[PDB]
C-alpha cells in the first residue's frame, strides 16, 4: 500500500505471589501493543532527445542514458537507506566521545570502537555493522585488527563487527543545478545493529519505460526511470562514535 499498517498483538501479565494457607490469589492483566507505520514514496527522472541527435551523433546512444539512470538510481538507493542513519539527531544516550588518551597512535580509535561495542551491549543492543567515511579507512581497518606492539602492549583485534561500509557523498551536475547526497562526515561513524529495525520496502525496484513522443517534432520517446521504494530506519539500533 501507499502506507503500511501497524502490527498488533496481545500479552498477558501475571506475577506469582506466595499463597499462604487458603487465601485468595490475585488475578493478572492483559494488554496490547502496536507496531509503527512505514510508507513508500516515488522517484523518477528522464531524458529528451531529438531523433536527429541520436541518429547523427556517433557517440550518443541510449546505452549511456541507461548507464546514467542506473548510476543515479544506485546513488538514490544509498541516499534513501543511509541518510536516515546520518541525519538523525542522536541523543546523548547513543553518542560516544572520542576518548583518546594523551598522544596515542591513531589506532587509538580502538579505544572508541571497543566502548561503542560496550555501550551497544550495555543498552541490550549490539553492534555488528560499522559505518564511517573513507577519510579514515586506513586508520579504522588498522584498528579492527590488533595494533602493533606499543610500549609493551599488544592490543587485541575487535570482534563482533562483521563488515564495515564506507559511504562517501555522491555528487552530480545536472545542467546548471548540482545535486549532492551527504555522505558520512569524516571522523564520525555509526555502529549499527542490522536488519532488525531496518526494513527495505519495495513495490517496483526500477522500470525504465519509453515515454510519450512528439511525432510532430520527430523527438524520440522520453526515456524515463521510475522506482517505488521506501525505508524504515530506527534509533534503537545505532550508536554514534567520534573519530
Amino acid at each position: 500500500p501507499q502506507v503500511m499498517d501497524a502490527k498488533w498483538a496481545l500479552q498477558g501479565n501475571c506475577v506469582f505471589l506466595e499463597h499462604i494457607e487458603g487465601e485468595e490469589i490475585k488475578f493478572g492483566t492483559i494488554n496490547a501493543e502496536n507496531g509503527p507505520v512505514a510508507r513508500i514514496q516515488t522517484y523518477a527522472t528522464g531524458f529528451e532527445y531529438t531523433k536527429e541527435m541520436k541518429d547523427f551523433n556517433q557517440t550518443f546512444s541510449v546505452e549511456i542514458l541507461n548507464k546514467s539512470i542506473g548510476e543515479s538510481y544506485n546513488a538514490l538507493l544509498n541516499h534513501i537507506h543511509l541518510s536516515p542513519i546520518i541525519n538523525f539527531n542522536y541523543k546523548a544516550s547513543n553518542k560516544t566521545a572520542f576518548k583518546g588518551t594523551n598522544d596515542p597512535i591513531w589506532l587509538g580509535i580502538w579505544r572508541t570502537l571497543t566502548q561503542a561495542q560496550k555501550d551497544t551491549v550495555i543498552a541490550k543492543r549490539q553492534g555488528n555493522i560499522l559505518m564511517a567515511s573513507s577519510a579514515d579507512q586506513i586508520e579504522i581497518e588498522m584498528a579492527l585488527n590488533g595494533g602493533h606492539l606499543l610500549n609493551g602492549s599488544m592490543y587485541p583485534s575487535i570482534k563482533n563487527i562483521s563488515t564495515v561500509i564506507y559511504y562517501d557523498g555522491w555528487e552530480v551536475t545536472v545542467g546548471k543545478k548540482t545535486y549532492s547526497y551527504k555522505g558520512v562526515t569524516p571522523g564520525k561513524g555509526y555502529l549499527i545493529r542490522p536488519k532488525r529495525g531496518f526494513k527495505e520496502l519495495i513495490k517496483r525496484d526500477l522500470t525504465t519505460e519509453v515515454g510519450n513522443a512528439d511525432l510532430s517534432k520527430l523527438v524520440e520517446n522520453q526515456i524515463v526511470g521510475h522506482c517505488y521504494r521506501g525505508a524504515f530506519a530506527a534509533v534503537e539500533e545505532n550508536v554514534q562514535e567520534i573519530s
Binding site: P1, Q2, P36
Partner: protein, 31 residues
C-alpha cells in the same frame, strides 16, 4: 486497496532459568 502489515519484531523477551548450575535439585512429591 490491499492491506499489508509491517511485520515488525515485538513481544516480551523470553526468560531463562539461570539458577540451575548453582542449586542441587531435589524432586519428590512426598516432601
Amino acid at each position: 486497496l490491499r492491506k499489508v502489515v509491517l511485520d515488525v519484531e515485538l513481544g516480551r523477551e523470553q526468560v531463562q532459568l539461570l539458577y540451575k548450575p548453582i542449586y542441587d535439585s531435589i524432586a519428590d512429591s512426598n516432601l
